[PDB]
């Protein structure tokens with residue numbers, strides 16, 4: 001309760017760790033770079049032991065409310081003809097925006113500052129110094145980075161040899177546009193030239209959430225520039241046909257637009273000194289893994305937990321934090337790489353794989369003494 005803690009960014013894991021920290025007696029603070037939380041995103045499956053975690057946060061019922069209601073989908077060709085349609089445990093498929101908002105609804109007690117960015121971070125035995133972009137300066141006992149795959153807190157506190165970012169050779173994009181098709185609870189996707197386009201409707205009938213997935217070795221100079229992301233999207237899907245151009249034209253007005261390149265972070269240690277990485281920052285499995293959503297839950301839970309049992313000793317708390325998840329992250333990260341290799345109903349062999357990897361770790365209770 002005494003120690004001053006800082007959580008950076010509102011993700012899944014970012015808000016998740018805050019709630020577990022607050023519930024365990026701590027009083028942390030959450031800061032965010034964007035003016036408000038970013039709700040935009042695709043549907044994500046909460047599964048494995050993460051479903052257990054969702055319940056004890058009391059948000060499981062809210063998740064089942066916002067779960068994907070989409071009834072059907074069919075795989076279109078370039079011309080619109082239908083090649084294939086709709087064919088082929090406690091877990092839920094829910095838009096991360098709903099999940100994030102549900103997570104943000106839980107931590108509402110916890111202070112959250114948006115429009116806050118860290119231009120500098122320093123560390124010694126006594127404290128952790130932070131320099132905000134607005135010029136404000138503060139020192140915390142511990143700092144947890146929710147930044148994710150591209151985390152700046154990782155590059156600042158770590159050198160090049162300590163961690164490595166692995167590129168799985170594919171990109172991903174999604175965003176919300178008004179529905180020109182007018183379809184409701186339907187999903188249309190066409191796979192051509194190792195590229196995929198996905199446009200669908202959901203509980204909100206007005207808007208259709210589009211998406212783009214293509215396998216490429218191309219490297220943007222700066223991956224944080226949206227227009228380079230957007231321009232790169234057009235260049236790749238130029239000549240693709242079908243509904244491509246009609247989607248790209250309604251793109252510019254989408255506020256939730258998200259672009260990135262599938263990658264997974266490999267690090268020996270997820271914590272250095274008084275600073276620790278959570279979520280995609282340290283262990284990110286990447287989108288193709290599909291379990292990237294869950295690692296935030298398992299990580300934010302064990303992180304906050306190990307710090308409480310530490311009784312003030314953070315070094316040991318972080319060492320037990322690293323040791324436990326590496327077994328889980330390893331088996332998990334390798335799944336995302338395996339699916340990254342690929343791209344009948346015998347193919348259900350992969351479904352059995354996920355159920356094995358998702359449940360593959362044992363959570364210390366931390367609740368029951």
Ligand SMILES: Cc1cc2nc3c(=O)[nH]c(=O)nc-3n(C[C@H](O)[C@H](O)[C@H](O)COP(=O)(O)OP(=O)(O)OC[C@H]3O[C@@H](n4cnc5c(N)ncnc54)[C@H](O)[C@@H]3O)c2cc1C
Pocket residue numbers: 008009010011012013014031032033034038039040041042043096116117118146147148149151152153172174258278279280281284286287288290292293296
């Ligand atoms: C908007 C968005 C959309 C996504 N869509 C998909 C998807 O469609 N499919 C998929 O497989 N995965 C997607 N992901 C990745 C996936 O959701 C995460 O890997 C997973 O949920 C774990 O989240 P996290 O804890 O790493 O936080 P993340 O989801 O990585 O979010 C990090 C948050 O921290 C904030 N932040 C980042 N950098 C800084 C900084 N320097 N200073 C302050 N704040 C910062 C950002 O506002 C961001 O909301 C998305 C992530 C985001 C942020």
